Each structure stands twice: as C-alpha cells, then as structure tokens.
C-alpha cells in the first residue's frame, strides 16, 4: 500500500525559513520522482519542481526558483523541500505527488497536505 | 499410621520417627511465608533438580533425619514430612 | 530461443553465447572424502529455476550497480530456505542481463563479474560495516565507477569475465561462472565470492527527457549441493 | 570472542609416528656458575622440566641415544681472550671430579671434547647404556633390599654425568659462564601406552600429588 | 510450564456448601492423579483425596468421606472440589497438587491456596 | 533385532513378524495415466522414518484407544508438511505397538486395524460432528467398547488383520497395512482409511496399587507419492 504521510502544520514570523517532509512508504523510493505542488486558499494549483531521488537532479518552476530547495533521503526515505524569506503571501498548503515509473507526470498518490 | 517429628521450633538436625517401617519413602517439604511449596529430598536421599547441595538426609528403617550444613536468611521456613508408603498419607508437625 | 530450465523458462531471446568465464563449468566435487564426510545431498531438480530480480532503472544520470551472488539469494525461495538450516554449499551460477530499448536509444553497458571484490571507503581509515555490504536483493550502487570503488581502474577491468551490452548491436549477455574459491565448500552467510557488477560507460540520451530503459537480470545457480542433513545413526 | 570456521583436507599419517613424536631437541638443563663450585655438574636424568616429564611418561619401556649439543654464553663481571672449555662425560663405575684442578679430569678413559667459545656448539651422540633392553620409566620396586630402600629407583637404569670447565689458569679479570643443553633423543622404539596425567607434579623423585 | 491456577478465596454461612477448582495448564491432564490438601491456620496439613481423571475413580480419607466430593473435567481441563454441611471448623486453606506419571505420591507441582 | 527405515531406527525389539495386512504391500500405483496427469512426485527418502506418538497409560480401568491413521500424522513433521501444499496421497503404512511390564504383570490387549470405520454417537438422532472424529495426535477413547461405538460386537472384531499382545508371552505387535481404497488417490484432510486400535480385553492386576504399564505406538508410511508442484510451462 502507497501511503505518502506528510508532517504536521506550522507558521513563521516573516523573514524566516521553513522546512517540510513527505515520508513515502510501500514501495521503492528510488525509482519515482517527488514532485511538489502549492495551492493558495480558495484558489488553483501550481507546480513547483520535483526532485529525482535516484540521481539528486532538480528541475524546478521559473517562479519559484528563488523560494524553495528540494531535495531527498535514501536512507529515511523521505522528500524535504525548504523555503527560504517567507512573506505574507506564501500562506497556503503544500502537497506532494509521485510520478510514474516511466518519467510521466500523472499523478495518483498524493499527500494530505500541509498549512503555512 | 502416625509420624512425630521430635523438635517444635529451631533458634540444625531435624528428625523424625515413625509409628511403623517405612521403607525408604519419606520426602521433606518446605513452605515460603509467601505461601509456596517446593520439595527438597525425594525418597529420603536424593535431592531435587534444583536446590541448593547443602541439604542431605539420613537412611533408617523407621527414624529419618534432615542434615542442613549452613545456614541462611531464606533458609528459614517450616520444614515438614510425608510417608507415602500406604493410604491415608499423613504429614509430620513441622519445625520453626 | 529459450531457457527451459526446471520449474521456470525465460522465453524469447535474442541469440546469445555461453561464453564460460575462464574454462570451466560446476563439475559437482570430483573428489574430496577427506573433507566433511557426510556425503552432500545434491539437490538438482529444486533449485535451478533463473530467480528474476527487480527490474531497475536507467536514466542519463546514473552510475552503475552490483550485486553479491550468494547473497542476493539468501532469502528467495528454494535456494533461501537451504542457506539456513546448511552450513556448506557449493555452486556455480548463471547470469541473464536483457534490457530493452527502441530503435532511437544509444548507449552502453558493461556487465562484468568480479571474484573476491573486496570494497573500500572513500576518505576514511574505517573499513566498511557489516551493513555496507549485506545489501542483499536490491543490491546498492557505485560511488566511484572510475575506480571500482578500490582504487583498480575501470579502464583494466577487461582483464574479468565480461560482455557488453551495446543498444546499437545487441541488447542482452550471458556468463557462466564456475566454483572459485580456494576452499572445496564455503560459508553462505559471511562469504561472497563473485559479485556481478554492471557499469555505463557511454551514457544514453534521447530527444525528449530521462527515458527509463529498464533492465532485467536473472541469475540461476547450476550445479548445487550442500552438507549432509540425514545420517544414519 | 569470534566463532569461525574452515574446512580442512587432510591425508597424512606420517606426522604422529613416534619416530618423530619425540624428536624435537627440548632444553634439559640451565645453569650459571662463576669463574674467579666453580664447575658445571648435572646428572643426565630426564625428568627436570615438566613439559618433556608429561610427554615422555605416556610409555612405561622406550630406548634411544641421546644427541647432547652444549650452547656457552660467557661474560667478564669486556673483551674475552679466547676461553677454552672441556666436557668430560662420567659413566658408572668412573669417579667424578669434586674440583677444578682435580686429577680426574687427566682420566683418559672417559670422553671429552675441548671446544672454544667462538666456535658452533659442540655435540656429541651417546649410545643406549642400560644393561636392561629398555629404559624403565616406571619401577615398581626397590633398589635397595631390606626396609629401606628408596622407592621406584632403578639401578640398571642409570646413565652418567657430564662436567664442563674452563680450562683457562686464573686470569686477572672474573667472568661469568652460562651453559645450556639440549638433548634429542633419536632411533626411538616405545612399548605400553599409559594414560597421561593430569594433576601436578610436586617432586623430582615419585609420583606424588 | 506447568501451573496449578485455583480460584479466589470465598466464604459461606453455615449449612451451606461450596465449590472449588484447581484449573491445570502446560501437560496432558489425563495422566496424572489430582490430589487435594487441608490446612488449618497455624497447623499443618491433611490429605482429603484424590482424583483419577482418566477413569473418575476416587479414593477419600476416611474423616473426609461425607464432606467432601471429588470431579474431574476433561474439556475444560479443571479439577473440582465440593464440600457439604459447613460449620466453623471448616475454615481453613486448600491445595492442590499433581502427583507423578507413574501413580506415586511425590508432589512437584502445588496450587497457591483458596481460603474458606 | 532394529528396524532402520531412513533416518530413524526402533532399537532392541522382541522377535516379531511382518503379517501383512490381508495379503499385499504398497505398490507403487502400476498404471493409471488416465486419472490427476501430472505424474506423482512420489517422495521416498524424506517421509519414512517411524514418527513415534506420546506413551499412553494403561491401568485397570482403561478402556481402549484408537487412532485414525491419515489423521494422526497431519501436524507431525515431513509427512504433515506434505498434507498441506498437495491434494493428492498415495500410502500404506507399518505400525509397531510395543508395551513393557515385569514378570509380575497379567494382561492382553487387541491390536486391530479397521478400514472404514464409521463412528456413532450413543442415544440420540444427531451424526458426529467435526471435533467429535478430527481428534489428531491425541487420539480417542471408546466410550462403549463392547460395540465398537458402532453397534457391531466386539466379538467378532477379529475378523479384521489383528494381533494380540499377551503379556505372559509377548509384548509387541507388528501390522503392515495397504492401500485400502476405492479411488486410486485420496484426499487427506477430509479422508480417514485406517483406524488402528488397541482394547484391553482383560484388565490388568497387581499385589499394590494401579502400575502404569506405559504403551508405545510408532507409525511409519510406507511407500507415499502426492502430485505434481512443479511442471514445465
């Protein structure tokens, strides 16, 4: 079984960083990319980038190039991504997906989700 | 059948005698405060897997004794007898 | 065009060689009464079945695999459950690398098999744990193909029983290994004694992005035998 | 405290004849003496060290030579001017020599071989000399007669005594000397097997414990 | 393991009966011989009875002979016990021990006690 | 004067005679391709070695015990393995009953071997249920053994293949027992062919009080074959 269990919620002062995670179990974590999403409250969705566990190569969305960092734990087998001079506007819920065997972006596992 | 055993209490031979021959067939018991029982001597001379080698008991036709070398904190607890030569089995009056 | 061995067949090749590492097939312990003489069992019909393995994935990025032979067996099937309750084997194996990509693939392996590969790591003076190397079925991953993770070049490491595997020409390769050990019967739970390494030299590439091309090895132990678990009196 | 393992192949059984069970030249003797008892007797007896005692008491009759090779290490108490020993070997029924300048060791009947420092150690071979067929290790029996006697003592089985001296007159400066031998025993032939033993010796002489 | 599991203790008025068990667990029941124990408070003991649970053949001491009655249960694996017309001298402890597999009376196995 | 079948051996017997049951062995299946096609595996140096039961009690009141023979040895060892994992058998078996007493000891029991014996609760309209014939090792206990639990006297039980152990003569009994069916292969869960059991016809006595008399049974199957696990494609 497929369970992608994020971590808690939690708020920041502005100025600050925060740091996330997307604990995968029930299946090989090397071989899927972890890609991650953003949704502002009561409005669409928005890609991020994604991080390739099994080389550490980011590819990442043009406006978020400067926000966040992503990248990823073998061992624990567990996705990070860190944001970096949080401001009024990044308050939402972060999610993350998982891609396919063959490099598809499709995505049916997700997250639950996580406020800031 | 009734079988006496010759001291009341103990402040480190206890013996006991028989109304008749008994054959061998005498065991010695020992009862916890707690309220647990485990023997200690079957068929007068042997010892029971698991007990300290200390104990020893003597061989008669009709007048066994128990030998116990040192003594100890735990040690103490009242030590009774058994014939089980012929029904009914009756027991002794115990010491300390 | 197939592999008909025992229980199992993997069918459907494409024409491939036999070609034996060194000169020599299992044989089956000629002659030793003068060692652990209770005499094997050698089970023949419940073991040779090409145990599959877990496909893996090869994208541009990556950068080889290995895998130690007596131990990427331990805990599958017939042959797992003989590693315990044994104490002594004797074994020769088969291996059976087969990727698959398209017409407008390019790229290169190199599937070599090292005897005795004693590793080592990097920038320390610490040998390696016990948990570095029992790795087991998923096997683990090279940190510096260049140096075979030792300090010997992968420029001489030709000199090993070895294939290639050229998606231009071919897309498969096959090694039989003899018994190589010094001893007559080994220990199956602390002793390794080949390990299958393959290596991409020339990395793929392609017009769109990341193309798995996943490979499939498959490895089958020969000419089996083990200690005596039935005896008289 | 790491348990391992390692098969083995073996086809030899050459290696425990007793032929070569007991030929392995072990230490019998150690002691010093200063030149200023100044002289080296010791009686050929064979149960002196208790390593080749245990080994050699497994049997009850055996019989070999002897190959007694003597190893001199001298010191000045700093060069030595070319000391020159002898070793004179006193069978039974010869008189043993009780000084240095005694006039036994003139006795030109028993052995004796005149070796220097510098030179390889000396070594001589010496035949079976029991009257019996075979040394008894074991003796159930007194020597001597009447009530006293002592114990297990065998008069057919004795040997001899060998005596080393410096040759040398009295030389201002007093050294030293350190004599060691090292018997092998050769051409063996064993009778009776008995069991070995286990708890330590406490005398030279019997069988206590 | 062998254990001798006894209820817990009870109390009756008197002309009343009661009954007991001695539940055994960790060897065969139907080899062994049952027997049942007496001690008053401050005395020492008194053989009652036995049971044999492979044919329910008892054998009873001669002053125990109208008190008390001796079962056996093979299903349940529990050796019962009942008395009959309490007075007040019938308060005391009761045991219960094992005898051996051949039909010796030599105990190795004792219950913990049950007062009355 | 030992009976070394496999891995296992009955020491030190009496002298003793292999009366077959009726007059046949084992077999081996002669020739049946029209029925399960897959040819039986026919396992025979991993089953056969005297998986001997717990030692029942024998006093004066016993009443007798019985066994059922594809039953008793479901849950015991290499032979119980095999009940699960196939749907199939094939077996006969060798049972050696043995009892030791004194000089001073009087006595006779009735070995006999039932095929198909078909069990009846006393005094009532309801058949047996599961737990009441699926005893396992344990066995059983006649309730009622002067008619068999089925009606049929015991008097004329001797019409089944029986031996008598007579502790003024002997104490051992030895029955070998074919493959006593209607199908050629049976199913062993739900199938019980044998029902070997033992009756105290005169009880025993002695001067004291209640001797044991302990028994032994050992049950060994003789030439066993299941169906096929492993097929080509």
């Known amino acids: 079984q497929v369970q992608l269990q994020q971590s808690g919620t939690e708020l920041a002062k502005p100025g600050a960083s925060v740091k996330m995670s997307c604990?995968?179990?029930?299946?090989?974590?090397?071989?899927?990319?972890?890609?991650?999403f953003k949704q502002r409250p009561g409005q669409g969705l928005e890609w991020?980038?994604?991080?390739?566990?099994?080389?550490?190569?980011?590819?990442?969305?043009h406006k978020f190039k400067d926000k966040a960092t992503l990248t990823a734990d073998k061992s624990s087998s567990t996705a990070y991504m860190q944001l970096s001079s949080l401001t009024s506007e990044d308050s939402a819920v972060?999610?993350?997906?998982?891609?396919?065997?063959?490099?598809?972006?499709?995505?049916?596992?997700?997250?639950?989700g996580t406020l800031v | 059948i009734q079988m006496i055993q010759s001291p009341s209490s103990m402040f480190v031979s206890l013996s006991c005698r028989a109304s008749?021959?008994?054959?061998?067939?005498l065991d010695w018991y020992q009862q916890k405060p707690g309220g647990t029982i485990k023997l200690l001597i079957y068929?007068?001379?042997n010892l029971n897997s698991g007990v300290p080698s200390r104990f020893s008991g003597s061989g008669s036709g009709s007048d066994y004794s128990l030998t116990i070398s040192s003594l100890e904190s735990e040690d103490f607890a009242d030590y009774y007898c058994?014939?089980?030569?012929?029904?009914?089995?009756?027991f002794g009056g115990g010491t300390k | 065009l197939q592999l008909k061995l025992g229980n199992s067949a993997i069918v459907t090749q494409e024409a491939a060689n036999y070609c034996c590492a060194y000169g020599e097939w299992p044989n089956y312990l000629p002659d030793h009464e003068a060692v652990a003489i209770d005499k094997p069992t050698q089970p023949e019909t419940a073991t040779d079945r090409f145990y599959t393995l877990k496909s893996v994935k090869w994208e541009t990025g990556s950068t080889g695999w290995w895998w130690k032979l007596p131990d990427a067996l331990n805990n599958i099937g017939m042959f797992g459950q003989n590693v315990q309750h044994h104490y002594l084997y004797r074994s020769g194996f088969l291996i059976h690398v087969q990727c698959n990509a398209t017409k407008f693939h390019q790229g290169a392996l190199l599937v070599v098999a090292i005897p005795e590969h004693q590793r080592g790591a990097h920038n320390t003076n610490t040998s390696p744990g016990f948990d570095d190397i029992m790795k087991g079925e998923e096997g683990g991953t090279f940190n510096h193909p260049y140096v075979l993770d030792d300090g010997t070049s992968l420029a001489c490491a030709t000199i090993f029983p070895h294939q290639w595997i050229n998606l231009r020409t071919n897309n498969s390769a096959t090694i039989v290994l003899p018994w190589m050990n010094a001893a007559p019967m080994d220990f199956p739970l602390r002793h390794n004694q080949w390990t299958l390494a393959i290596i991409p030299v020339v990395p793929l590439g392609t017009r769109t992005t990341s193309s798995m091309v996943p490979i499939t090895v498959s490895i089958a132990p020969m000419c089996c035998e083990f200690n005596g678990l039935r005896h008289a009196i | 405290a790491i348990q391992t393992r390692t098969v083995i192949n073996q086809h030899g059984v050459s290696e425990t004849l007793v032929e070569n069970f007991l030929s392995r030249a072990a230490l019998v003797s150690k002691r010093s003496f200063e030149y200023k008892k100044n002289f080296f007797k010791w009686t050929i007896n064979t149960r002196s060290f208790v390593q080749l005692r245990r080994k050699l008491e497994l049997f009850t009759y055996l019989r070999f030579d002897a190959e007694i090779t003597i190893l001199t290490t001298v010191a000045v108490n700093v060069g030595l001017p070319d000391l020159t020993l002898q070793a004179m070997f006193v069978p039974t029924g010869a008189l043993t020599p009780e000084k240095q300048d005694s006039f036994h060791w003139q006795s030109g009947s028993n052995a004796s071989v005149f070796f220097k420092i510098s030179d390889p150690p000396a070594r001589i071979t010496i035949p079976f000399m029991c009257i019996n067929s075979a040394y008894s290790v074991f003796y159930d029996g007194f020597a001597g007669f009447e009530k006293n006697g002592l114990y297990g003592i065998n008069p057919a089985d004795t040997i001899g005594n060998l005596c080393v001296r410096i040759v040398n007159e009295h030389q201002p400066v007093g050294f030293t000397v350190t004599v060691r031998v090292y018997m092998k025993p050769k051409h063996i032939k064993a009778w009776a097997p008995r069991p070995p033993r286990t708890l330590p010796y406490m005398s030279i002489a019997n069988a206590n414990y | 393991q062998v254990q001798l599991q006894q209820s817990g203790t009870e109390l009756a008025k008197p002309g009343a009966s009661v009954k007991m068990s001695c539940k055994a667990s960790?060897?065969?029941?139907?080899?062994?011989?049952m027997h049942w124990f007496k001690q008053r408070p401050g005395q020492g003991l008194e053989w009652i009875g036995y049971?044999?649970?492979?044919?329910?053949?008892?054998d009873y001491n001669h002053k125990f002979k109208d008190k008390a009655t001796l079962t056996a249960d093979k299903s349940s694996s529990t050796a019962y016990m009942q008395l009959s017309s309490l007075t007040s001298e019938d308060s005391a402890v009761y045991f219960c021990?094992?005898?051996?597999?051949?039909?010796?009376?030599?105990?190795?196995?004792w219950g913990q006690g049950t007062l009355v | 004067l030992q009976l070394k079948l496999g891995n296992s051996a009955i020491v030190t017997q009496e002298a003793a005679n292999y009366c077959c049951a009726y007059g046949e062995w084992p077999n081996y299946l002669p020739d049946h391709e029209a029925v399960a096609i897959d040819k039986p595996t026919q396992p025979e140096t991993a089953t056969d070695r005297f998986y001997t039961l717990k030692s029942v009690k024998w006093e004066t009141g016993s009443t007798g015990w019985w066994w059922k023979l594809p039953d008793a040895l479901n849950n015991i060892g290499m032979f119980g393995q095999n009940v699960q994992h196939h749907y199939l058998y094939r077996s006969g078996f060798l049972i050696h009953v043995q009892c030791n007493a004194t000089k001073f000891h009087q006595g006779a029991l009735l070995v006999v071997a039932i095929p198909e014996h078909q069990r009846g609760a006393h005094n009532t309209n309801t058949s047996p249920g599961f737990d009441d014939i699926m005893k396992g090792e344990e066995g059983g206990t006649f309730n009622h053994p002067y008619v068999l639990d089925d009606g049929t006297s015991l008097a004329c039980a001797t019409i089944f293949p029986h031996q008598w152990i007579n502790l003024r003569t002997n104490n051992s009994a030895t029955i070998v027992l074919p493959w006593m069916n209607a199908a050629p292969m049976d199913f062993p869960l739900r199938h019980n062919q044998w029902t070997l059991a033992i009756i105290p016809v005169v009880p025993l006595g002695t001067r004291t009080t209640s001797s044991m008399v302990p028994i032994t049974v050992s049950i060994a199957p003789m030439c066993c074959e299941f169906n096929g696990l492993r097929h080509a494609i």
């Open positions: 008749q021959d008994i054959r061998g067939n």
């Open positions: 021990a094992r005898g051996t597999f051949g039909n010796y009376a030599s105990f190795a196995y």
């Open positions: 058994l014939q089980r030569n012929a029904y009914p089995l009756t």
């Open positions: 068929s007068t001379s």
């Open positions: 049971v044999n649970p492979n044919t329910d053949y008892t």
């Open positions: 960790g060897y065969t029941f139907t080899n062994y011989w």
